[PDB]
Amino acid sequence: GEVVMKRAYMAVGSLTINEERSEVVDFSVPFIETGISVMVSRSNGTVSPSA
Amino acid sequence: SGQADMIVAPLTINNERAQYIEFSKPFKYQGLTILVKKEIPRSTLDSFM
Ligand SMILES: N[C@@H](CCC(=O)O)C(=O)O
């Protein structure tokens, strides 16, 4: 919102490119790939019989 | 040269390329890797000797 209201020129940070923002602000090329991922704790490993 | 108006192909976004043509947002985010031949374990008949 501080680039929309001309309060600054660029917004360097963890901004993700998406269609909603790119219609109101110009995004540079992605300098790192991100997205949506799910983080969970590891499950209890079970040793299969007949090993 | 005007022969094609678009390049729908795996065109990586390069610095030298982007100077002359205008790219888009990527479809596939990927890098470069090395493809080798899997080491097939060959066995003879006297391997126990
Ligand atoms: N990096 C996101 C916020 C964090 C999230 O993915 O929820 C953004 O710039 O909007």
A10 in contact with chain B, both atoms CB, cutoff 8 A:
no
User: Method used for this model?
Assistant: cryo-EM
Which tokens sit at A11? 């917004």
Q: Which atom of ligand 1 is nearest to the CA of A13?
A: 9
User: Can you give the resolution of this entry in Å?
Assistant: 3.2
Residues from B in contact with A at Cβ < 8 Å? 13, 23, 25-26, 29
Q: How far apart are CA B48 and CA A6, in angstroms?
A: 78
Q: Residue type for A29, please?
A: V
- As a whole number of Å, the CA-based R_g of chain B is 22
**Where does B1-49 have alpha helices with state H?**
15-20
Instruction: Report how far ligand 1's centroid is from the alpha carbon of A14 (Å).
Output: 7
- Those residues whose C-beta lies under 8 Å from the C-beta of residue A46, and which sit 6 or more positions away, are none
